Design a protein around this ligand. Structure first.
Ligand code: ORA
Ligand code: ORA
Ligand code: ORA
Ligand code: ORA
Lengths: 11, 11, 11, 11, 11, 11, 11, 11
């Protein structure tokens, strides 16, 4: 299991 | 742009 | 960019 | 078992 | 420096 | 109830 | 409850 | 220098 926290440029 | 957070089961 | 943390069973 | 803490450029 | 992630019952 | 996140300089 | 992470200069 | 990773019951 991996947790993620950030941003993406598009959905 | 979208702020994104959560979990992923595997890479 | 995404900050990532968690566990992996094997390399 | 291995634990990870860092960043990735894309999901 | 310390980072926090959680909940509080009141402001 | 309130979800809270951020940074604190010292305890 | 709050998840907490960071650094402290000395005990 | 010491690094910390855990939880606290209140801010
Ligand atoms: O590492 S980043 O700089 O890319 C960064 C920065 C933020 S944040 O805006 O500064 O805190 C968020 C984030 N926060 N999102 C808000 C949700 C509700 C209200 C306001 C903000 C989020 O939910 C997920 C990922 C994030 C990644
Ligand atoms: O070694 S790195 O410099 O690449 C580094 C730095 C951070 S951090 O932002 O400075 O603490 C994180 C991280 N933290 N993520 C936040 C989660 C919620 C709120 C704010 C931040 C995370 O969950 C996983 C990996 C990380 C790797
Ligand atoms: O550890 S907890 O279970 O107490 C937990 C759970 C959440 S969350 O709702 O499931 O992701 C958050 C959180 N998220 N807040 C949202 C912001 C914008 C939209 C939706 C949600 C947040 O910004 C800060 C702390 C949180 C702590
Ligand atoms: O050892 S503990 O079980 O007490 C534990 C567990 C978690 S965790 O939620 O399972 O990964 C965290 C943590 N993670 N916090 C999130 C930040 C952003 C999004 C989701 C979660 C954190 O930033 C600091 C300390 C933690 C300590």
């Amino acid at each position: 299991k991996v947790k993620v926290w950030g941003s993406i440029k598009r959905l």
